Design a protein around this ligand. Structure first.
Ligand SMILES: CCC[C@@]1(CCc2ccccc2)CC(O)=C([C@H](CC)c2cccc(NS(=O)(=O)c3ccc(C(F)(F)F)cn3)c2)C(=O)O1
Lengths: 99, 99
């Protein structure tokens, strides 16, 4: 689809058997979620944002279906305000900016 | 143009007679810059980010030319991991997401 930017570009995702909403964020290198329950090993990561730095769990090779498109990649889990889909996943669904 | 997301979507801007680079950020409601020297009155604002909250100066009706497109809108000035162009300005240049 084409999505305009008069409102937040929020989409429905399925991850780890759970349904969430998340923001398509071209400013984010990475994908950051909260309150998801991912299986298996992870490693600590620190990421920077507006407001400071955040400690997250880094989970690799995680299946996630984003607006009906199945992809796999790294998902960070930690205490973000809104769920964010970053460029690491947006490239996998073929998303571009256009003006 | 069309811009893919394999790298950060960075564009050149002119604001207040100075040249900067900034990140096209569909996750950001607002536009946040640093090191800009804007004229005249401003109001304090607090904004939330993934890592906490930031105190910024809010300047209204600021001319800014973003990749050669002249627009006007609110610009927030304060700390950020990088200069960010948010949806408030991206709608004015007719930017959309497409997948
Ligand atoms: C003004 C934008 C503020 C924003 C708003 C988040 C939000 C939205 C709705 C409701 C509440 C909160 C959006 C955003 O992209 C980030 C930053 C980048 C500016 C962000 C988002 C996601 C992850 C990261 N960390 S990172 O390691 O992937 C990373 C670090 C730095 C940058 C850089 F390009 F900005 F430098 C991009 N990515 C940062 C942020 O900190 O919060």
């Amino acid at each position: 689809p084409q999505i305009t930017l008069w409102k937040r570009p929020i989409v429905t995702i399925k991850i780890g058997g759970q349904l969430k909403e998340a923001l398509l964020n071209t400013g984010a290198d990475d994908t950051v979620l909260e309150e998801v329950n991912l299986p298996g090993r992870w490693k600590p990561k620190l990421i920077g944002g507006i407001g400071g730095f955040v400690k997250v769990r880094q989970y690799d090779q995680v299946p996630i279906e984003i607006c009906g498109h199945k992809v796999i990649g790294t998902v960070l889990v930690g205490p973000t305000p809104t769920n964010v889909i970053g460029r690491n996943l947006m490239t996998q669904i073929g998303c571009t900016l256009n003006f």
